[PDB]
Design a protein around this ligand. Sequence first.
Ligand SMILES: Nc1nc2c(ncn2[C@@H]2O[C@H](COP(=O)(O)OP(=O)(O)OP(=O)(O)O)[C@@H](O)[C@H]2O)c(=O)[nH]1
Ligand SMILES: Nc1nc2c(ncn2[C@@H]2O[C@H](COP(=O)(O)OP(=O)(O)OP(=O)(O)O)[C@@H](O)[C@H]2O)c(=O)[nH]1
Ligand SMILES: [Mg+2]
Ligand SMILES: [Mg+2]
Lengths: 303, 303
Amino acid sequence: TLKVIGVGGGGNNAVNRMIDHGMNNVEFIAINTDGQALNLSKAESKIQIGEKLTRGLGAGANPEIGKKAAEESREQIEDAIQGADMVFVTSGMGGGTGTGAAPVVAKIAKEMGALTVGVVTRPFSAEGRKRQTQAAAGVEAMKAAVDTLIVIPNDRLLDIVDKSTPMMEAFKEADNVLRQGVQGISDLIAVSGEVNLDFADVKTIMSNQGSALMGIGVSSGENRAVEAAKKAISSPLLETSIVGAQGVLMNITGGESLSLFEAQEAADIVQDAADEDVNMIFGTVINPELQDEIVVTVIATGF
Amino acid sequence: TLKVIGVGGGGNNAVNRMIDHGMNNVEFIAINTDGQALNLSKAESKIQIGEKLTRGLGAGANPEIGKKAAEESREQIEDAIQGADMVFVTSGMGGGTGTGAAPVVAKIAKEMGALTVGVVTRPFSAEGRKRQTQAAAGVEAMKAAVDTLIVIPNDRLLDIVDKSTPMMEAFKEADNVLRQGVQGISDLIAVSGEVNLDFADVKTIMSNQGSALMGIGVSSGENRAVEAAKKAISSPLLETSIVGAQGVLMNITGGESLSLFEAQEAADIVQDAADEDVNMIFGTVINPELQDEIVVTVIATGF
Ligand SMILES: Nc1nc2c(ncn2[C@@H]2O[C@H](COP(=O)(O)OP(=O)(O)OP(=O)(O)O)[C@@H](O)[C@H]2O)c(=O)[nH]1
Ligand SMILES: Nc1nc2c(ncn2[C@@H]2O[C@H](COP(=O)(O)OP(=O)(O)OP(=O)(O)O)[C@@H](O)[C@H]2O)c(=O)[nH]1
Ligand SMILES: [Mg+2]
Ligand SMILES: [Mg+2]
């Protein structure tokens, strides 16, 4: 009676999240151009489009490919729609597959008679200008091919999460913040007994200082070192009041691939942000359970 | 070498979170007045204080009890400190146990020679005026008994989570938002086949409307009905632009205890917020996996 079709990479991930969470009496269909990513989809129906233009590879962030690739497979798409009274076209706008194919997939199911509802997201502004522009063009194309369209701008995703967070889960977040503050110091000073830092350095930093401020920044990807350091500096506690810090304690924790040059980089970032006479000591921790994300946590004292 | 002591209810929950997450080379101690809650603590060291004043019950949000209850057990507290070079006093300020005992526990370990570091949180402003005032008094007492004090105001917890959220986890949140939007409609209309709503009502609401806006609000506790409805109305998509909605679709999902009067209440809240000529239909879903929290999700159309 109801069919939900995830088109694109992020569209498939949302569908897989709809399945892992208990969802019944809905028929799932995964549409994508990445051959490998469709193998990861838990959806019953899987449709690969545009194999002649991509050879099983991704659409390559070009929405013009996504438009044609969906047109080349008009046959198979209509077959999966058959029998549906209402259809959900869930996609992430800004890419090449979802940005181009989702409007096509919508117009097919709409002209086939079903109630076509689009449920899409605008990308984060940090993803670049081109991805935002392509998304805007796709949302306009989506609006002209659906009965109703739901637009989720990722820039306002933080507040949607806040209103959808119960008070029980809120304290669980506060629990993890207290953990990150304590672990950020203990994993740096008392580190078993091969080679690490000592105590007298930490003593001078925190002995009878008084009020302290904390910042946490987690980042991954190419420029993960600069980004994680920037995120930690712009936390509400330290964005306006690290320049007066006379003592700084920094913990950088990363996966197996965490280079030592990457550690000095984030250290130099926090060091420059602090006072000129700052007394900064830092160290590095290798937690392999983190795949390739780093967690820069910094404590500031003095004032 | 390092000891972390969670004093109070929330203090124990943070310690248990420090243990479930892989944390090594630290000695955990749980201090509290709730006899049952200390049975739930995974900490190796457990200390119940003030059994004569509370008989194993909670301190009752009176910080004066927490001060004496920690003084009555000065003996056992000093025994757990012994051998520590640095001690962490993690507590939630605003209560009765943590607000009063944590300053005492800190001054004991500080005069015993260890490096005393306080890691506490201010309560949410939504928790009341008295709990904020008691926390402010306790933070002042904490500051006068520790070497350094870390203050986490829960009002700014949302931004700390944002900077500590990697881009991989950010899309996982967006995945769950798309799920909540689609599930909020499918669980309302096509509901198997005993007794529920029909299709022609949903057809008139969404046929050729165009742009739509979504709001999600999750709440639990005593006044959970009004709160969850208020949270959904003040989402970034609907807080400024539901008054012009000519059609509203509302899904209220709750646990086993979800009363039917509770459903009409939240419906009347959203109904009043919309336009006078609004065409609102709604329904109720019982998901027992939710213990006692409700999830009000609302779709708006028209404009
Ligand atoms: N909900 C959700 N959105 C995502 C996810 N990953 C990326 N996005 C968003 O979707 C936009 C486009 O990414 P994709 O959907 O993967 O692009 P695609 O069309 O599937 O991939 P290409 O065929 O190479 O163009 C990005 O700008 C992100 O904002 C995800 O895992 N979940
Ligand atoms: N980190 C964290 N903080 C919490 C948690 N629960 C409550 N809090 C905060 O702690 C403050 C006081 O709550 P509790 O710590 O439970 O008070 P308590 O002293 O342990 O309990 P009483 O002995 O009855 O006074 C509240 O205002 C909350 O803001 C939690 O689970 N984790
Ligand atoms: Mg992809
Ligand atoms: Mg308690």
